[PDB]
Design an enzyme around this catalytic site. Structure first.
Site, PDB file in Angstrom:
ATOM      1  CB  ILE A  60      -1.040   0.015   1.153  1.00 11.35           C
ATOM      2  CG1 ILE A  60      -0.371   0.044   2.526  1.00 11.35           C
ATOM      3  CG2 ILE A  60      -1.974  -1.192   1.037  1.00 11.35           C
ATOM      4  CD1 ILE A  60      -1.312   0.165   3.722  1.00 11.35           C
ATOM      5  CB  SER A 116      -2.254   6.498   0.639  1.00 13.58           C
ATOM      6  OG  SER A 116      -3.297   5.598   0.272  1.00 13.58           O
ATOM      7  N   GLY A 117      -2.582   6.377   3.588  1.00 16.93           N
ATOM      8  CA  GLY A 117      -3.308   6.166   4.824  1.00 16.93           C
ATOM      9  C   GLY A 117      -2.355   6.345   5.990  1.00 16.93           C
ATOM     10  CG  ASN A 118      -3.895   6.806  10.030  1.00 20.63           C
ATOM     11  OD1 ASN A 118      -3.973   7.904   9.457  1.00 20.63           O
ATOM     12  ND2 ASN A 118      -4.660   6.493  11.053  1.00 20.63           N
ATOM     13  CG  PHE A 119      -0.344   1.540   8.543  1.00 22.71           C
ATOM     14  CD1 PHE A 119       0.238   1.211   9.779  1.00 22.71           C
ATOM     15  CD2 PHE A 119      -1.724   1.400   8.384  1.00 22.71           C
ATOM     16  CE1 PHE A 119      -0.547   0.696  10.817  1.00 22.71           C
ATOM     17  CE2 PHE A 119      -2.515   0.901   9.418  1.00 22.71           C
ATOM     18  CZ  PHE A 119      -1.937   0.551  10.636  1.00 22.71           C
ATOM     19  CG  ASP A 133       0.145  14.354  15.682  1.00 18.36           C
ATOM     20  OD1 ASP A 133      -0.997  13.983  16.006  1.00 18.36           O
ATOM     21  OD2 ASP A 133       0.375  14.948  14.611  1.00 18.36           O
TER      22      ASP A 133
END
Length: 279
Positions: free
Chosen positions: A17, A19-22, A130
């Site tokens: 993958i 994109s996204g939070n990882f 954060d």
């Protein structure tokens, strides 16, 4: 880049993958237990530094169901591989959009998990981190477990004091963020932000600073729920409800599950990180 697939004896490659939070990550399934993991890669050599070591050790110390948990580091010929839990139920926000808005009870279900995770994170911090509260994830489709991404390798969420003050308490700013998540669950949209002008940041910020929001008349919430929301959305951080006070709030306490009430050695990890400094 990511290196070629490795440790096929223990892991199946699900998909790469981007994109996204990882971020750029490799999704894998552990062959032994069937669990999905996300793998992040850092090039061997100068990038493997004291920051990486601290981030890994910090990550590893977080043992709580509502945090994305560290699994292991693996040395490959070209990269350090950092294996952690993957949340496979998408973003919380997408589940809200699908539903339109959550009921009070569904919102509470997730809020209890959020607060518990945030309280845990706070208890393990020597400094503010954060927590990416704007984008918490879900694991599972049915009775989903909320996952905070406490690791690192819309302005609606920003508390007024984060914009205005030279110094602020990061934990108290997190309370405001938790309130933003509560509101979006109950309403189906962000507070403050103009839904027709999402990129008018100035307008959203002026509304944050004025605490200008309202819960729509068609959204009916209990008095206890209103009480919680009103006590979170106060501009003055000194008067904002705290996480311990939220944990003793009757809206939070209602239907609280029993669980929410009241691996490698470090030696092995450190040796892998040391070896990974050599290209």
């Amino acid at each position: 880049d990511m290196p070629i697939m490795h440790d096929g004896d223990r892991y199946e490659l699900v998909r790469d993958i981007g994109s996204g939070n990882f971020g750029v990550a490799r999704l894998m399934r552990n062959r032994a237990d069937g669990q999905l993991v996300a793998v992040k890669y850092i090039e061997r050599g100068e990038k493997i530094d004291e920051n990486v070591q601290r981030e890994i050790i910090n990550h590893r110390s977080l043992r709580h169901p509502n945090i994305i948990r560290f699994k292991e580091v693996i040395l490959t010929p070209t990269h350090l591989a950092i294996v952690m839990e993957y949340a496979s139920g998408g973003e919380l926000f997408e589940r809200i959009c699908n539903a339109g808005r959550f009921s009070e009870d569904e919102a509470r279900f997730f809020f209890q998990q959020l607060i518990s995770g945030v309280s845990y994170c706070h208890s393990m911090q020597v400094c503010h981190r954060d927590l990416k509260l704007e984008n918490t994830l879900l694991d599972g489709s049915t009775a989903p477990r909320l996952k905070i991404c406490d690791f690192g390798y819309t302005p609606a969420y920003i508390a007024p004091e984060v914009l205005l003050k030279k110094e602020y308490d990061g934990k108290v700013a997190d309370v405001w963020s938790c309130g933003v998540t509560l509101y979006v669950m109950l309403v189906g949209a962000y507070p403050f932000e103009d839904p027709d002008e999402p990129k008018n940041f100035r307008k959203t910020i002026q509304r944050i600073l004025g605490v200008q929001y309202s819960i729509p008349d068609y959204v009916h919430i209990s008095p206890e729920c209103q009480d919680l929301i009103s006590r979170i959305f106060v501009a003055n951080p000194a008067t904002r409800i705290t996480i311990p006070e939220i944990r003793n709030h009757p809206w939070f306490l209602k239907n609280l599950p029993a669980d929410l009430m009241d691996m490698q050695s470090m030696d092995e990890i450190m040796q892998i990180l040391a070896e990974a400094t050599i290209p």
